[PDB]
Each structure stands twice: as structure tokens, then as C-alpha cells.
Amino acid sequence: NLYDKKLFNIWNQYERLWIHDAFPLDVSEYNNTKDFYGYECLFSKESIFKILDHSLERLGWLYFGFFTDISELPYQMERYWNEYESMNKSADQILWDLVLRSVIVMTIYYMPAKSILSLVDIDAIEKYPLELKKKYEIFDYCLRHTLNKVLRTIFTLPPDVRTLQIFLILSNTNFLQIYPSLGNNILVHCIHLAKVLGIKDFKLKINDSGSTRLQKLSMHNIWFRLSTVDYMRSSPNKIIALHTDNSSALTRKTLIDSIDVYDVESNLEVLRWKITSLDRDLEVSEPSLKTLKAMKELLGLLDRKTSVSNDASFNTKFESFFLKLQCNFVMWKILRYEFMQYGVTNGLQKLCCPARRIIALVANFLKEDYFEYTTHPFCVHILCVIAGFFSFYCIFHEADEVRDLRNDAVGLLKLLFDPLRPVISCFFSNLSRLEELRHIWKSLVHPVMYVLKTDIIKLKRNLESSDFLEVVREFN
Amino acid sequence: NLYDKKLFNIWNQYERLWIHDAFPLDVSEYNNTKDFYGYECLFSKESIFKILDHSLERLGWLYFGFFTDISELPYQMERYWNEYESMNKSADQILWDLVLRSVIVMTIYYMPAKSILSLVDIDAIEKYPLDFELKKKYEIFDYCLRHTLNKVLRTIFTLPPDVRTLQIFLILSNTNFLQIYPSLGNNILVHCIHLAKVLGIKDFKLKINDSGSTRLQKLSMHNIWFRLSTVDYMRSSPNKIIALHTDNSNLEVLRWKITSLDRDLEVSEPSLKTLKAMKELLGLLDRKTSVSNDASFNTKFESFFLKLQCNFVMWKILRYEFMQYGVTNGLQKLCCPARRIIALVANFLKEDYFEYTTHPFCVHILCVIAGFFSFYCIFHEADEVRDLRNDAVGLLKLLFDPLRPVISCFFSNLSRLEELRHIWKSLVHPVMYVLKTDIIKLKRNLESSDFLEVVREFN
Amino acid sequence: DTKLFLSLPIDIRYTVYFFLGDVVQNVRPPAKSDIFNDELIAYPNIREFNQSLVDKYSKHIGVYDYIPNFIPNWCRDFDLLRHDIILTDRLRVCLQYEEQWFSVQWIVVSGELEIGIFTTDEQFLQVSYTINEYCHLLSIAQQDLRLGINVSDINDVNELCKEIQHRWLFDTVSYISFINCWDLDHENVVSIIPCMESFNNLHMLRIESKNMFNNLINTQGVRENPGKTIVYNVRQNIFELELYTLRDLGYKSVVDLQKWEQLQCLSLSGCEFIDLNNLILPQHCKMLILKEVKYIIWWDLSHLLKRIRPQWIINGQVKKPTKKEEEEESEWYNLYLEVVQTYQPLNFIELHNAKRVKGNLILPARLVTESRIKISNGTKVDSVLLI
Amino acid sequence: LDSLLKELPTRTAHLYRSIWHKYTEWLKTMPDDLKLFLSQKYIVKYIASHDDIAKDPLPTCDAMIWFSRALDIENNDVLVLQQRLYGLVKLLEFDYSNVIAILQKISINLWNPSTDSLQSKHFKTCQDKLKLLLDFQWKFNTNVSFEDRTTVSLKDLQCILDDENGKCGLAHSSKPNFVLVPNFQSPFTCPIFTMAVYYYLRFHGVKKYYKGDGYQILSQLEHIPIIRGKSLDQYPRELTLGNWYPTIFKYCQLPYTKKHWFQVNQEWPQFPDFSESDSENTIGIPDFYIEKMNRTKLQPCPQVHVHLFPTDLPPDIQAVFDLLNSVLVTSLPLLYRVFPTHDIFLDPSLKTPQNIAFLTGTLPLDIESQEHLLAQLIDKTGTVS
């Protein structure tokens, strides 16, 4: 039981090192790489307009949250097409080019295969390097081209807000979990741009026109999405941060430009940041128990406010899905902390219930032919950690409930996911390793926990019949 | 005289906004733009080795301070030449390539014109754009710089985190670079700061039973981190707000100390025992400074720069005193530091080391000095200050091609300020009212009052 | 039984002890109003009454000594309440969440230090324990703790604690209380004001009287008494605050506390009148806690109520949907912003039952949709509206 | 009312009720109805028994005030009572004899018949020295205003002789209110002994040297002043004494503040005011007041068989003069052994074979007692010990 608490601390560190689990190093390889974007290159004008139509239909969420007006986008699009045709420069035009390109790439990542495969041209396949694999390879080619263009035009540029939007528009992809160091560096640059422009002046003032209100609103949405990612993507590879400049929503007892919450606005970006701050206060800062009681009450209240959102269109289902997903995930983390540290009773069953809710949700979103919405990386992080802990306590203890839930999670995740092949493959191999560890422990400073001590030591140094036990260690 | 204290603070902010004062958009115009480094391209490897010899002779200071071993550099050079010859990749090789290129560029910035003009090829001048002196030298220097920058912008993001990027930036900071391409420099500075905090380079806390290699590693880390804080204070306009000089509180230490006194001067609580302790401490550090004895070019260079920093900061401190608390004889006791500075730059002209004068820090210094001297020359009379200011401005116009826009802009607005003397020469005065308007114009440019506005509109 | 009760989880024991707040002794003194009534309850009891504790601890006990046999009761109570494992888990658990139940501070009697655990209302004593006993029961550390001044603990005893946590020990204490000694005098302030330098674990204060408050705190009464008031470095280090027990806070008063900076939470209880329009504050302090008092005078909000139309009003809540009516939309935002700017440095307002508020409540919806505005059923108001 | 009772802290109020209980019980000790309960007499009796409460009488007195205003009492009554009570806390909160070596240091020097270092005009005789000394010892013991000092007619004075309880002294129940008591432990610093010698000199006089005033005028005169100036019937003038005083403080080398001796001194204890004795009180006054302010235990009047003062007089004054006789005659052999050169001894009366007999007989107390006192004078006499 004290052993349980200790190995649960070990599992904390082991999940950190779980999650701490090609690109050419030279832009000039893409110096002359063709396009997808010319009239004859890959993607006709009309295909692109269709893509934007689908995007505004299904996935308004992101860029709706950012910009002021969005007929702006087709307007600028057609203007750029006219200018391109006339040319057979400036800053505005190139920025808007990058913006539309990134918008598109997001839409590609969240499209069904058959549609895009019907849209794409043909002989350009002969021109280019070559189911879902075709979709993802063409997506990757488009991504790398956009990345070349945008790296160049990022450095060589004045500071303008729209660069930030690019990153945020692209963070909702495999990108940051496929090109991590790159992403972290550019995130640092975007953080600098954030603090540059004084976007902390979403402090809404008196007698401001509607335009000014909308500007501050855009700033506000931007800031909070940025703080979300900056906490969510904060491995020791990064030490510079912005998630400190906000403040916890907890109303603590034990305690300027540091922004507080509940004093500003109500747009659900705020809600996401609140939830992330609760996770943050769980992880890094003082873990208490009255703290958890208040957090749990507050999170039930916010789950009410989440389900207040009523079904009227795809994007609404998407948002409510992601919010309820986050809420149950954080409840699961809290109740994990409880049942791991202080052994309150029935918390295990009241913890298993959230997992069942999550899995009912993703089942609903497969069965409704919304599998593309499932592909958000946060969902995959979630299933990763869940399967991790469930395998852990399934091998250390027996409960057919746990076996069933874990088997559902892993059968789902294996049978459904190509996209994030490196991460999932590393996780799957080390998971099968832990299953062989089940065979070991099934066949008290145990040698198995000693092997896991060795494993964390291997990782910590990777930062910068004991004979047979070492034998199986070498075997795996 | 209280009016003097207030308007001296106003001149402080106006100098702040002074110091808070083409390269293309899509890095593709320079996609295929010529090297200087190839066998047939521009410079002849052996000439380059000669350049390196000249660099190591006179200017070990910078890169001697950074790296561990420096035969490393000719070693890597010859290795790349062999590899270049064999080729007719990896990360290490590209870093070292860029390293030597930047080293060379520093050497270019601190070379005489006639020499390099003798080195450069001829039909390669026909290959490239001309400007045909120093203007030619500076145009070819600019081309080399922009080429290097093209190369490094691409290759910065796409890399693991390695120390040597920092070395690049530091080798390149000692140039016109940051005051001609500021925003670029600031962004790369932010990235380098991230790399600094990544690697835990605050672990120069030297420990027991470490090898000499480890001592040298920690020394390099120490010098680098502190040079970084030096630049990060000196180059901290509101365009950048992220910083590392907050994390503070071998003579690299000494330079950082001097910067911390300047910081405490500018931003924090002005007391009087504070200034007394600072000035005694700086005299102590002048003792520690003069302990260095003249024995070689780099040594004269270093001791020059250190004495320059010390007198500049003393000048700032004593200015702060005489503005805020009005002690007597301070004008002359302030003029003396300037005279010491000027004896130093005189030494470095007479010794035929004018190239060493071209460091941007010296020009920032002379800028602020001539600024304050013009201020108190027009508002008050002292032929000493007038004479020194005339020396400074005649010097700076007659001697300095490199920073042509800034000095010229400064000179032009400075010549504008001489007409303001005539105004004040022709009491909440309209002139101080004009300076209120002027600081407001600049701060908002960031993001017979009739005749006074008339002359304002004329200029 | 005992071990059956101890084979159980913590929430159970928590709620149980919450119902058993603090009654560990077999007795209780009254409030003040029940004094002049000559009715004494009953305490006919007998010996096992050592003359080692009744003589020692009388400075907090012998005040009463005027009833049926109480001190032998008290004496055997203190005796038997050194072995209640009940109590040890009571304290392990109450400490675990929050000791709003037991007020626990330092004491010295006979020149011998101990740690006493009292009521909260005025801290009638219950028992005490030795530091080594305490942290053999628990883990030893600089476990933050409380302290208050009585006529029992004033100056030399107080300076004895000072010099003991200098010489023998270190200053393991945070929070300071002014429960009596309302005169600003008879050596309490004289002792303590030079003594807040080794005193750097704290953020928290508790105050009693309008005399002591007005003559120490309310910074309009400006003077030049250096040892009579605080050093301002502690005025930085006081993120929390508490106060009780007065009649007329703000009736034509000088209510303003801008010097009281780096404050982050206020607590008020047990009073008889208050108005918030006189109230002025620093920034940084939004947590406001307010307990059972008489009728409150809210902010005015009268002109702003005159600004309003029933164009939009529904169910006590309002909004403009019409983007076209920037006239009405800008007006809406002007109204909302005036509203919050009245409450500007506040985000959390707790009321226990105060029986009345008089001042035309119109509030935002962002906060009452949540539990920021946390009123008990002091439901004697009707002029409610939300934004 | 009840709100005023609510106005207070809580520990203090519990304490107050406990003390109400205690005082009610200690009053149940006696047969005996709220001012009789909270009576100055009964309260001071309680405190005389409860010296423990005299250690923390601050809330004691404040609670007594709080009850004296709790019920229907005239507010003037409780505040004049409060004036008396502040007098009491001032009296009791100080328990040592600090205002004292100034007494000693002076009294002695003013007794000393030969003062050489004194070149000052006044103080030629021993009667001048004694006149001043009586005024000083008197203020010092009774703490009274000067003006009031001159208001008192000695026919007003009342001898207290109670041998049942063993008390003796001189009392005044009139405008200034006070009680004087003989110090037999320290005759020199005793104001009554002083007054006895001075009165012998004043009245009997010294044959062939200084005319007595005669004992006859104690009738024909309406006001007999405790000390006479130029005129028989009047106290000396204020500025006169005001001169005499610094003159002596100088010679004694003690700092002098006129306000101390010519006006009431508040840092100092006082008798209460009241608008023939018994066990625990004398004129109006509890005895501890009197023993404290006169700083001597109360003792019965010693019976002497020798009469220096007249045994034939008006009944009114007689008792007084008999008291004076006993103190004088009790302590005279001592004065004779110290200052045999004193004017008093120059009378032929004191020269008789008997009076010489008793002056040279057993000593009232051993010599080695008054050493320290003697060490305090700046002219050593012919007899050095």
C-alpha cells in the first residue's frame, strides 16, 4: 500500500518519460520542389474552394475563434488568384498566402479520404512522389512545402499577428508530435511575438467601438489557445514558458501583469485554459485534498456548462466532444491521484466510469462517420496514458473490469491508427514489453520494480534468479 | 536647477528613444547567389589561412574566450577543404562550416581595405557586383554577411540543440549587424536564449575533481552565458521583452558586473550610499583593470575595452548624481572621464588600430556623449563641453563610413538640434515644451508658440 | 469501537469530526450573554485533581473558577486527553485538510513552552502538548503554526518565545492574532513590533477592535510613531487578513487601505453594521469573506439602474444580440464595464447569514453562474438583476 | 445599559463576573444594597484582606466603576469615586519608599545644631531650622497643598489615642484631610517629634535666650497656625518659605523643585476626601493609608512619667500636648546623645538633677541604629561616630 503509493510515484515519472518519446536539416533540398498549388500543379481553384466550404461547414472552431471576419478569407483568396494569374512583392499578400495554405492543410488533416482522393488531379501524381496512406503522404508533402516557405518568410519579416495564427492553425495536427524540436523553437518565437504586441491588452476598456471589441476578442482567444499549447507542450526540451503569466482558477488560500481569470470574459477558450490550469495545479504545485475537493466540484459544474451546448451542427458536437473529453480526463487524473495516494474507497469504480464515458464517446464518433474528428492528437495522448495506467494496474492486480476496458482501448487504438506511426509504435512495443513483464511478475522490493528503476535510470541518462532477470532485461 | 534635474530626466528618456532606433522577404532571391569560399569562386584558401593567422594574432579574445581548443579551427578548416576537394550530410560539419565563415566575416570587419583588396580575385570581381576605398570593402562585406545569413536562417530551426549556434551569434554580434538588421538579430537572439536556458549553462558552478577539459567547458559556458547577458541588456529595446539579465543579481564576470551597475543605474532605486559604494567598487575594479599589463595586441584591445566600459559607466553614474542630487564641480569631474576615453581612442588611432575603433559599442558611447554634451551646451554654457562636443562630432562625421544611416540620421537630427539652440537663444519654456512634444512624437511612433510650431513644421 | 473506526478511509472520519467540531473536553464555558444569568449548568465531581496543572495553567483557566466542580473536571479531562487515539487521528486528519476547527498556537507556562489547541471563537483552552510529543506523533519540521496575544501572553513571555525561537530553536510560526489587549498598550505592541524580523514564514493577521483597527490600521490616521506601527516590509508580507468584532465600520469613516499592499484575501466576521461605498482597497485582493452581521449597504448603482431599459430584460438577465445596434451594444458594454468597475478589485464574495442587504443588487452573470458570489440564505433582498 | 455590558471583551467579562462572585462571598463573610455592596469602605476592606487582588487591581477598579455605572447611579457619583479610585491605584501600584533618602538626608542636617557651611541669613536659631523641617516632614508625610497647609488651625487638630487597638496620632477631618503618626523607629524623620521640640521652643521658649510665646494665648487667639511667621496668629508667607527651601536643598546638595512642596504632587500618594476611630480606620480613613503614607507601623502611645509640657490646659488641646509630651520625652535622650549642643538643652528646666538624670539614663534605642542616618550630614559635629 505504501509500496503502491511509491510505485505510483514511479508511474508518474514513467508517464513523463513515456511522453518524452525524415526532416532534411537543410531547406535547400526543397529549394526546387514543385508545389501543389498552381492552376496545373495539383489542386485546381475549384477543389480548393470546395475545401474551404467543407472547412467552414465542419471546423469553423479554430479560425472562427481567431479572426474578426471570415468572408475576408474567400475575398483575399480570389484576389490572390487574380494577382497570380496576372503575374503568370509585399508583406500582406505573402502572409495571406501562408494563412490560406495552413488553413487548407488543417482541412486536409480533417478530411475523409474518398473526397480528397476524388478531388486531386492525376498526371501530377506522375510528376510527384506518391486507402489513407496516399492521403497522408500527400498531406506530408504539402506540409513540408508550407514549412519551407513559412520558415523563410517567418524570419525575414516584421512582427505581425498573423504568423501566430499559422502556428495555432497547424498545431492541431500530427505536426508537433512529429516535428517536436522544430515546433518548440517556433513556439518560442511565437511567444516572443505574443509578448511583443501587448496582446495581454484584451482588458476590455470603456467606450471602445465594436471593431476594438472584436480586436480584443481575437487577442483573447489567441492568448488562451497559446497558453493551452504552451502548457501542453512543455517537456524539458523547453524551459521558456507562458503558462505562468495566467493564474489558477482555484481561488486558493495559500499564496499585476500576471493575469487572473473570472475577471475578463466567458468564451470557452477560457474554459479550456481553466481545465488545463487545474491539470497544472495537480501536476507541479502543492497537491492537497481540500484542493481536490474544490477542483472536483468546480469541474462537475463545468461539465454541466459543457453539456449545456446543444446539438445543432457538426462543429458544436466537435467542441462539446473535446470539452467533455478533457473534463473526464482531468477527473480521471484527480481520482487517480486520490486512489493512488490516500486510498479512499470506491474511487476506482468511480474512476473506471469516466473511461467508459470516453469510450462511449469515441464509439459514437466512429459510428457516426466522424473518425476524422477523432484524429486530434490530444485524444491520442489521452488513450495513450489511459492504456498505460490500465496495463500497469492490470499486471500488478487483477480486475476483469480493468482487463475489458484496457482491451477495448488497445484493440481500438491498434486497429484504427496509422497517422502517428512512430509514437504509437514505440508505445506498442514498450507495452508488449510490459506484458512480458506481466508474465515475469506472475510466474517487497521486487526485481520487477527494480528493473523499472533501471529503466527510469536509463531514461534519465538518455536525457543529456537475478541472472535470468537481467537476461530478460537484455531480451527487452 | 530643479528644472535642470527634471529636464535631465527628460534628456534621459529622449536618449532612451534615440537608442531604441534592404534585406529581402522570401529567402529565395539568394537561393543561388554566389559563394566566396570555393576553390575557383573568390578568395583562394591560402589567403583565407592568412586571414585566420591575422585573426589569431590580434583578436584571440572573443573566440579564445569561448572555445576549448583552437588548433581545432585550422584543423576543421583543412578538413573541410579536403572534404570540399573530395566532394569536388550531417550537423557537425555544417556547424563548423558556418563557424569558420562567421570567424572570417568578423576578420573582414576588422581588416584594412587595401589588404583584402589585394587578396580578392579579379575575374571574380567581374563575376560579382561592383561598387568601384572603404565603400567597396563594406559592400563586399555586406554581400558576404547576407550570404551567411541566408545560409544560417534555413539551417537554424532544423537542427538538434547544440552550443555552437550561440558561438555563431556571438562571433557576429561584434559588427554593424545588430544595428542595421535589428529585428532579425533580436529573433535569433531569442532562439539563442532558449538554447542557453536549455543546456543548463548556469552550471558553470565549478565543482571538485573535474578534469581540465571540464574546467574549460565550464569556463566556456560561463563566458558565454555572461556575454549573453551583456548583449541582452545592451540590446533590450521594447521590440524584445523576453530576457535573461534578470537571472543575475574571470573578467567576463567583471564586464557583467559593470553591466549590472548600469542596469541598477537605469531601472532601480536611486540612493546615495548606493552610488558611493558603486563608485568605490568601480575604482577597485579599475585597480583590478590596470593590473593587466601591456604585452600583446589582444591585451591592449581588451584593456582598452575594459577601461572604456569603466569610464563610460562612471560617466553615467556621475551624470545620474549631478542630475538628481546636484553636487558641485560634477560637470568638470564628468568631463574628465570623457577626456580619458578620448585619450584611449587617440591611442588607438595613433597606433594604426583605427579598425579597432569600429566596434559599435564605441559609437553608441560617442553618440550618447555628444547627445548629452549638445544638450547642456545649448541649455548652459561651458567652453570645455562645447570643445569636446565639437571634437566628437567632427571625429564621428570625418571617420565613420560603416554605420552610415544611423550616424547620418543622428547627425542630421543633431544638426536640427543646433537650430533649437538658436530657438532657445532667440520659466516653463517653449523649448522644454517642444521637447515634451518630441518625446511624445517618438513614443507614439513606437507602436511665441506660433513661431515655435512654424519652425517645427519647417523641420 | 476504535480499530474498527480506524480501518476506514478519511472522508468518513472527516465528516464525523466536522460534526464533532471541537468539544473534546467534557465541559464548556458559556458565551458572554449567558453570564449574567445566574443559572449554572451542573458539574458535581470529585478528585484525581493534581495540583501540578490547576496551579500552572490557571492564567487561562482560573479566570473562571466560579461554578460547580469544574477544575477537577478540567484536570482529569486534560489527563485522559493525552491518549485518545481518537484525537490523534482527529488532528492528523483535520491538519490534512484544514484546521479551521482547532486553533493551534504556541504557549509558555512556568517558562516551559508547549503547544495549545483551542476553540476559534475566543480560544478557550482545551489541551496542549509538547513539541517532541507532537512531532513524535507526527513529522518534525518547521510546521507552520499560529500565535495570538492575550493578557496571558503579552511581553516577556512573548519575548521569551522570541528569544527561544532565536536561541534554542527557529521561528516556526506564521499567523498573528489580536484577540484582547485592545488598548494598543500595556506592552503587547511594545513587545511585538520590534519582534517581526525573525518572523518571515507568515502572511496572516487577525484583528478585534475598532479602536485598535482605527488607531493601527486605517491609514488616514497618519502619525510618526515608528515603534507604535508596522515597518511596511511586513505590510508587504501579509497576503491574508482577518478581522472581527466591531459595531460601525464605515459610517462616515475613513475606510482606505492603500498602504496595506500585497494583500490577497480579506475576512470579516461578527459585526453589526457595514457599508461598502466608503470602502477602498488595494489591488491584488479579490477573495472577500464576510460572516454573520447586520444589514449591509451595497454599492449605490442608482444612476446605473437609471440607465436601463426593459428593451432586453428577461428573467433577471439581459443581452443585446443585435450587432446592428452598436448604440445599444456599446451601451450594454458600457453598462457592464461600469458594473465591474464598481467591484473592480473583487472576484469572490462570501456571505454567511447577515439577515439583510439594502443596496439594489445588480451583478454580472459570469460569476453567479459560478459560485463566486456565494450568499447564504440572507434572503431579505429583492432588487436583484444580472448581466 | 446591557449594550454597555456587551461593549467589552470576553475573557475580561468572565473575569469580571468571577470577581463579582468572589466579592459577594467575601461580603457574605460579614452581615452586610448595591452601594453598600460596592462600598468604598467594604471594597478597601476586601482589598486589605485580598492583597492578591492589589497585585492586579486594574480590572478590579475598572469593574467596580463599570458596576457603579451599570445600574441607576448618578454619573457624577461614579466619576468622583473614580477620582478617588485613581488616587487609590496611584497609592498602591507603588510599594517601595523611594521618596525617602531625600527625607533622611534633609531631616538630619536640619536637626544638626551646628551648621558651619551655612552662611545664609535665615536659620540662625534651631527654631528656624525646626520650623522649616516641620513644614517639609509634614508635606512629605501628608502630601498637602501649601495654601491648605496654612488653612489648618491647630485647634482643629484631634488627638487620636486608642490603646484598645494600639494607635496614636494627630488627625484633621476638616478641609484638608490627613493623619500623622509618630515614628519611634526614626525620631529625627518623625514630624511629630519635630513638632514637639519646635513647640517646646515656640511656647515654653528658652529661659534667658528666647521668649516662649506663653501657653496662655491658646485661648485668646482664634486661629493657632501649625507654624508661626512674624505674626503670632498667621502661617509664614509663601515666598518666605520659598526662600528657606532652596537654601537648605542647596546645602544638602539635592535638586529642588518648588511645585513638589508647594502644591500637591501627583506621582505621589494622597488621602481621599470625606464630606475618634475604630479597629480598621481612624478618622474617615482605612489604616493602611495611614501606615503607608506615614511609612511606620501603628503603635500605642508610650506612657511617660515626666512632663515637659503643661498638665493644666483647656481639654481640647490637652490631649494633643500629652501626645507631644510622650513623643518628645520618649525620644529626647537620643537627641541628647547626638546633638547635646541643641538649643533645647539650654533651658534651666532641662538642667535639673532629674531631667539630667533621665537624659543620661537608658537609651530609647541603641546608637548603632542611627549610624547610617548620621552619615548623611555635611558637617560632622564634635561627636563623630
Added chain:
Amino acid sequence: QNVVLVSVEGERFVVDRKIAERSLLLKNYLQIVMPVPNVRSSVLQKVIEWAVHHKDSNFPDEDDDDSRKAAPVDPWDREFLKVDQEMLYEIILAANYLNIKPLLDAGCKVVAEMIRGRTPEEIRRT
């Protein structure tokens, strides 16, 4: 409407649906049969006996501590719970499982009465 409930022994008790929607764990689990792990038969019988005795009753809140410590021990409950300690503790744990607070509050009230109406000899054994 009604619902079946499996005592983990396996006993398929039955309740009226909404009278069980009194509870909150149910009110979420549904939003007909349910399992009930680690509960026994007479346990749930007495549980539902209380639940049916208290259907139209009013209860203050789960935050009003003043109303909570305002402590009317219901007399029906008071006699209804005159049983031994282990079944009692199982009732208490079950109330914790089910988020049905007033019964839990009453149980803790009674246990507090047990350990308040005490004897020193309980300690003299210690």
C-alpha cells in the same frame, strides 16, 4: 417505473425507478437493471427502507454547514438505526458509494453521539 439491482452476492432486488433517482450516482449512471458491487442484502433492504421513509422530505444542501450541524437527529431514523456496528459501517460505506448524503450525515451523527456519550473507562482500558 422500476429497476433491478444486483447485490454483489447476486440478489436481484427491485426499486421504483424515480424513487431510486433520489440517488445521484444512479441519476448519472442512467444518464432495466444495475449492479451494486460490495453490498449485501439486508444492507440494501434497510437502505431502501430509509430511502422510502425519506422521499418527499426536504434537505438543505451539501455546502450549508450551519444547516448541517443544525442537528435534528430524526427520531424514526434514531430508532431505525439501533443496530450493531459492522452492518452500520457497511451502510455508511454504501452511502459514500452512492452520493446519498443525508443518510451518511445521520450515520455520522449517531456515531458522534456514541463517541460523545462516553466513559473514561473506555480510555482506562487504554
